[PDB]
Amino acid sequence: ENMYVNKVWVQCENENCLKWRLLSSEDSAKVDHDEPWYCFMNTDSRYNNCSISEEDR
Numbered sequence: 001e002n003m004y005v006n007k008v009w010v011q012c013e014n015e016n017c018l019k020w021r022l023l024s025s026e027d028s029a030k031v032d033h034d035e036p037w038y039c040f041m042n043t044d045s046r047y048n049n050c051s052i053s054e055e056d057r
């Protein structure tokens, strides 16, 4: 059942990293906007660590 959830960009809040990450529809729905978000919270295994380069658009 499609919930029509946007794929959104979020910025990592590790001050050493600050990289932007494009989330799946599912992860976009799950983000808790009252808590900090960090790269390791991304379930996309290609871009889920602060040591990984930012994706190109």
Ligand SMILES: [Zn+2]
Binding pocket: 012, 013, 014, 017, 018, 019, 038, 039, 040, 049, 050, 051
């Ligand atoms: Zn990061």
